[PDB]
Design a protein around this ligand. Structure first.
Ligand SMILES: *[C@@H]1O[C@H](CO[C@@H]2O[C@@H](C)[C@@H](O)[C@@H](O)[C@@H]2O)[C@@H](O[C@@H]2O[C@H](CO)[C@@H](O[C@H]3O[C@H](CO)[C@@H](O)[C@H](O[C@H]4O[C@H](CO)[C@@H](O)[C@H](O)[C@@H]4O)[C@@H]3O)[C@H](O)[C@H]2NC(C)=O)[C@H](O)[C@H]1NC(C)=O
Ligand SMILES: *[C@@H]1O[C@H](CO[C@@H]2O[C@@H](C)[C@@H](O)[C@@H](O)[C@@H]2O)[C@@H](O[C@@H]2O[C@H](CO)[C@@H](O)[C@H](O)[C@H]2NC(C)=O)[C@H](O)[C@H]1NC(C)=O
Ligand SMILES: *[C@@H]1O[C@H](CO[C@@H]2O[C@@H](C)[C@@H](O)[C@@H](O)[C@@H]2O)[C@@H](O[C@@H]2O[C@H](CO)[C@@H](O)[C@H](O)[C@H]2NC(C)=O)[C@H](O)[C@H]1NC(C)=O
Ligand SMILES: COC(=O)c1c(CCCCC/C=C/CNc2c3c(nc4ccccc24)CCCC3)cccc1OC
Ligand SMILES: CC(=O)N[C@H]1[C@H]([C@H](O)[C@H](O)CO)O[C@@](O[C@@H]2[C@@H](O)[C@H](O)O[C@H](CO)[C@@H]2O)(C(=O)O)C[C@@H]1O
Ligand SMILES: *[C@@H]1O[C@H](CO)[C@@H](O)[C@H](O)[C@H]1NC(C)=O
Ligand SMILES: *[C@@H]1O[C@H](CO)[C@@H](O)[C@H](O)[C@H]1NC(C)=O
Ligand SMILES: *[C@@H]1O[C@H](CO)[C@@H](O)[C@H](O)[C@H]1NC(C)=O
Ligand SMILES: [Cl-]
Ligand SMILES: [Cl-]
Ligand SMILES: [Cl-]
Length: 527
């Protein structure tokens, strides 16, 4: 057995037999007073000491959230749904310690995605026991409030200041600063990494002053704050908010007395009116997301980025080839995961009205023009594939490149990858390609378990990805030095070189999605 003494109490973990070795997991360590009762919506009060021995041998409650039900029984979607009881009592974290206890190990802190409305650290593909065993790092992950309960914003008023889930995250980075040396980790070598909404979170920690001391560098998988869905405005924030207030019938006008009303209301009621506070949602609507609150974020993050106001350090940034496809089957007409979704011109037209609901007629035609003077004509998948590229480029790929150009313009090393491998265990049909979020399992070293059906070449790709990620965390350079591996070159905004990840080739390419991103990041925003 193994007990570790933390700053506010003693915690017990369990031994995990992994790959002939042993990993020590501490699942479910509380890192804040439960945000309940008179504390719902408020920032996360810090946790008072205890005298027990905390039994941290199982994942804690997942935070309250709405569950995608568009594909009941289908692993490809249900893989992402929470796998622990949902409760407001839900601010806990997990620690994966290599056995035996390391001395001064690099710490990797994972932040999950979910459009700031969903997610949980318990997910199978966020299991860090593999990273602990193989590269001898410590892996930490935490639950943070999502949806309204985590991002409702009454700008100014502290019973709902906004950004609470981000402040949840931040106090957990604070926890590994005060406590991780007790686990054999090195609080001075912490790398944050996350995917999509998690990625935008960690790009926001690169901006938020209160986080600059709590980590060393950063890895942004398929997401960044300048993506169109990441930061909801301050006026559309509290327009979203008060729309909920009338739905719940909680409209006072002592601006504070609305909040007191939303706390004698039970969590399920709040969950079920979040969908309509944006009048015309899309598959990407962050109904309640990060806002400019003047505490975590003190100014519009695009300006902080444009004028070089962030933690100076190395970033590893990247995206997947078919980021957009996952969303077309969540709404778009003529699409389904059980056929090949060949849509005509007009099906595509009506599909832009769903991803661009408040965009002018001209704007929608503008997109149709850039994306359909074809490299040629026959192929009935033209509109099907154009629409997936439209969503992927606008929502993920071009924000991420634009983040990397602008970040690296202040002298820091940047590394850009481009993941283009489709898992063969992947259960979605083949026309959807390399989908949003399906690099995560390779990053976490799941293909290294041969017992769970992955190609041998898949396990090999996972093997260098993992090594590259770890060398980046520990040494700031994401190279694979030994096995005659392609060097990963630094991303300069001059030449814009990126590395491709797949089971055939590592290749160095240049100037990713050039023609498209010049449309997206300039001609298109003026409309
Ligand atoms: C936290 O966990 C520990 C151990 O859990 C371990 O976890 C997994 C991962 C593995 O490593 C396993 O080996 C472990 O299970 C818990 O420790 C248990 O503590 C209880 C305390 O009661 C033990 O129960 C028995 O203890 C005494 C021994 O003398 C008995 O006398 C007790 O029965 C008495 O109950 C009456 C009290 O009203 C008394 O009046 C009677 O005379 C009667 O004799 C009791 O049966 C238990 O044996 C321990 N576990 C093991 C495996 O031995 C710990 O409780 C956990 N804490 C939590 C969950 O909060
Ligand atoms: C800001 O809020 C108003 C009011 O919110 C409406 O009510 C909510 C419960 C929600 O379910 C939706 O009905 C609305 O968002 C919005 O005004 C609505 O606008 C739409 C068209 O945009 C119109 O059809 C509705 O009838 C309007 N409802 C009311 C009560 O006025 C408004 O659009 C929101 N956004 C902005 C930018 O102003
Ligand atoms: C691909 O599948 C979509 C899915 O719609 C189907 O609707 C059910 C009746 C049943 O057949 C299920 O397998 C699917 O969920 C098709 O979309 C429909 O198309 C018809 C006519 O084209 C139209 O009347 C429906 O309203 C459409 N429904 C939806 C949800 O889009 C689509 O036609 C299929 N395309 C190909 C090329 O196979
Ligand atoms: C960020 O993830 C979003 O989906 C998103 C939402 C999701 C909010 C509403 C739920 C709809 C489906 C959820 C299933 N959860 C999946 C996740 C991932 N990949 C999936 C791939 C296929 C099917 C389901 C997936 C990657 C990690 C997160 C969860 C709202 C607003 C913006 C968003 O993205 C900018
Ligand atoms: C409150 C919550 O969300 N989860 C509970 C958990 C279960 O989800 C619940 O019991 C429904 O099955 O139960 C927890 O533990 C119990 C002990 O607290 C109690 O003494 O009785 C059981 C003895 O083993 C049981 O262990 C748990 O299992 O962790 C508490 C947790 O918050
Ligand atoms: C851990 O490493 C830091 C430098 O990275 C060093 O200053 C510190 O003294 C070390 N402490 C332990 C306990 O290894
Ligand atoms: C009412 O509004 C005032 C002014 O913002 C505030 O001080 C007070 O706490 C609010 N609530 C009550 C119950 O007075
Ligand atoms: C490197 O190659 C050896 C065999 O020559 C293999 O056993 C090892 O796992 C490989 N490691 C990486 C990181 O590719
Ligand atoms: Cl045509
Ligand atoms: Cl037309
Ligand atoms: Cl253009």
């Amino acid at each position: 057995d193994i007990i570790i003494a933390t700053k506010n109490g003693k915690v017990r973990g369990m031994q995990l037999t992994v790959f002939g070795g042993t990993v020590t997991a501490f699942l479910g360590i509380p890192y804040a007073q439960p945000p309940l009762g008179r504390l719902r919506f408020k920032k996360p009060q810090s946790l008072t000491k205890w005298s027990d021995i905390w039994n941290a041998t199982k994942y804690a409650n997942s935070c309250c959230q709405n569950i995608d039900q568009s594909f009941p029984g289908f692993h490809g979607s249900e893989m992402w749904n929470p796998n622990t009881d949902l409760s407001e009592d839900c601010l806990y974290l997990n620690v994966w310690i290599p056995a035996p206890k390391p001395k001064n190990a690099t710490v990797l802190i994972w932040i999950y995605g979910g459009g700031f409305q969903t997610g949980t650290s318990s997910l199978h593909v966020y299991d860090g026991k593999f990273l602990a065993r193989v590269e001898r790092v410590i892996v930490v992950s935490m639950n943070y409030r999502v949806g309204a309960l985590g991002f409702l914003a009454l700008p100014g008023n502290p019973e709902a200041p906004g950004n609470m889930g981000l402040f949840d995250q931040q106090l957990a980075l604070q926890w590994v600063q005060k406590n991780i040396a007790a686990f054999g980790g090195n609080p001075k070598s912490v790398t944050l990494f996350g995917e999509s909404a998690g990625a935008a979170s960690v790009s926001l920690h690169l901006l938020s002053p209160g986080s600059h001391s709590l980590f060393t560098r950063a890895i942004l998988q398929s997401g960044s704050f300048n993506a169109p869905w990441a930061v909801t405005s301050l006026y559309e924030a509290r327009n979203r908010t008060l729309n909920l207030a009338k739905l719940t019938g909680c409209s006072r006008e002592n601006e504070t007395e609305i909040i007191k009303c939303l706390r004698n209301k039970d969590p399920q009621e709040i969950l079920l009116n979040e969908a309509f506070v944006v009048p015309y949602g899309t598959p990407l609507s962050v109904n309640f997301g990060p806002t400019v609150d003047g505490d975590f974020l003190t100014d519009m993050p695009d300006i902080l980025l444009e004028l070089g106001q962030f933690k100076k350090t190395q970033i590893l940034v990247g995206v997947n080839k078919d980021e957009g496809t996952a969303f077309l089957v969540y709404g778009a007409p003529g699409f389904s995961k059980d056929n090949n979704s060949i849509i005509t011109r007009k099906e595509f037209q009506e599909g832009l009205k769903i991803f661009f609901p408040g965009v002018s007629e001209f704007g929608k035609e503008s997109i149709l023009f850039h994306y359909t003077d074809w490299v040629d004509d026959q192929r009935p998948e033209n509109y099907r594939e154009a629409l997936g590229d439209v969503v992927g480029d606008y929502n993920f790929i071009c924000p991420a490149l634009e983040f990397t150009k602008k970040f690296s313009e202040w002298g820091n090393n940047a590394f850009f990858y481009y993941f283009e491998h489709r898992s063969s265990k992947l259960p979605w049909p083949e026309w959807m390609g390399v989908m949003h979020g399906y690099e995560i399992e390779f990053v976490f070293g799941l293909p290294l378990e041969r017992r769970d059906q992955y190609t041998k070449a898949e396990e090999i790709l996972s093997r260098s990805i993992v090594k590259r990620w770890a060398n980046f965390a520990k040494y700031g350079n994401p190279q694979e030095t030994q096995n005659q591996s392609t060097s990963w070159p630094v991303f300069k905004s001059t030449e814009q070189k990126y590395l491709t990840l797949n089971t055939e080739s590592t290749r160095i390419m240049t100037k990713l999605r050039a023609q498209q991103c010049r449309f997206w990041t300039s001609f298109f925003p003026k409309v």
